[PDB]
Curated annotation (Swiss-Prot), chain A:
The gene is RSC58. The chain holds residues 388 to 402 of 502 of the full protein. It is found in: Nucleus. It comes from Saccharomyces cerevisiae (strain ATCC 204508 / S288c). Present with 4460 molecules/cell in log phase SD medium. Component of the two forms of the RSC complex composed of at least either RSC1 or RSC2, and ARP7, ARP9, LDB7, NPL6, RSC3, RSC30, RSC4, RSC58, RSC6, RSC8, RSC9, SFH1, STH1, HTL1 and probably RTT102. The complexes interact with histone and histone variant components of centromeric chromatin. This is Chromatin structure-remodeling complex protein RSC58. Component of the chromatin structure-remodeling complex (RSC), which is involved in transcription regulation and nucleosome positioning. RSC is responsible for the transfer of a histone octamer from a nucleosome core particle to naked DNA. The reaction requires ATP and involves an activated RSC-nucleosome intermediate. Remodeling reaction also involves DNA translocation, DNA twist and conformational change. The lineage of its organism: Eukaryota, Fungi, Dikarya, Ascomycota, Saccharomycotina. It comes from the Eukaryota.
Curated annotation (Swiss-Prot), chain B:
It comes from Saccharomyces cerevisiae (strain ATCC 204508 / S288c) (Baker's yeast). Catalytic component of the chromatin structure-remodeling complex (RSC), which is involved in transcription regulation and nucleosome positioning. RSC is responsible for the transfer of a histone octamer from a nucleosome core particle to naked DNA. The reaction requires ATP and involves an activated RSC-nucleosome intermediate. Remodeling reaction also involves DNA translocation, DNA twist and conformational change. The gene is STH1. Disulfide bonds: none annotated. Belongs to the SNF2/RAD54 helicase family. This is Nuclear protein STH1/NPS1. Interacts directly with SFH1, CSE4, histones H3, H4 and H2B, and via its N-terminus, with RSC8. Interacts with LDB7, NPL6 and RTT102. Component of the two forms of the RSC complex composed of at least either RSC1 or RSC2, and ARP7, ARP9, LDB7, NPL6, RSC3, RSC30, RSC4, RSC58, RSC6, RSC8, RSC9, SFH1, STH1, HTL1 and probably RTT102. The complexes interact with histone and histone variant components of centromeric chromatin. It is found in: Nucleus. The lineage of its organism: Eukaryota, Fungi, Dikarya, Ascomycota, Saccharomycotina. It comes from the Eukaryota. Present with 1990 molecules/cell in log phase SD medium.
């Protein structure tokens, strides 16, 4: 579990 | 986007005090791992896509 790869989150990048 | 994710953030940040009455912490952390993995995959794919 990282931190800056966890606040920056859309549903446009889940895929 | 974040309306159901900040709730999970606050839910884990409140459930750091009991830490043993709630067994569902592990699946939530597995989904945090999934979100971090998908984010790293997207960042590598955006580095290659450019």
């Amino acid at each position: 579990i990282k931190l800056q790869n966890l606040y920056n989150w859309t549903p446009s990048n889940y895929i | 986007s974040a309306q159901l994710e900040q709730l999970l953030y606050r839910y884990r940040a409140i459930q750091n005090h009991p830490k043993e009455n709630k067994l569902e912490i592990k699946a939530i952390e597995d989904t945090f791992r999934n979100i971090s993995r998908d984010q790293d995959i997207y960042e590598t794919k955006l580095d290659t896509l450019r």
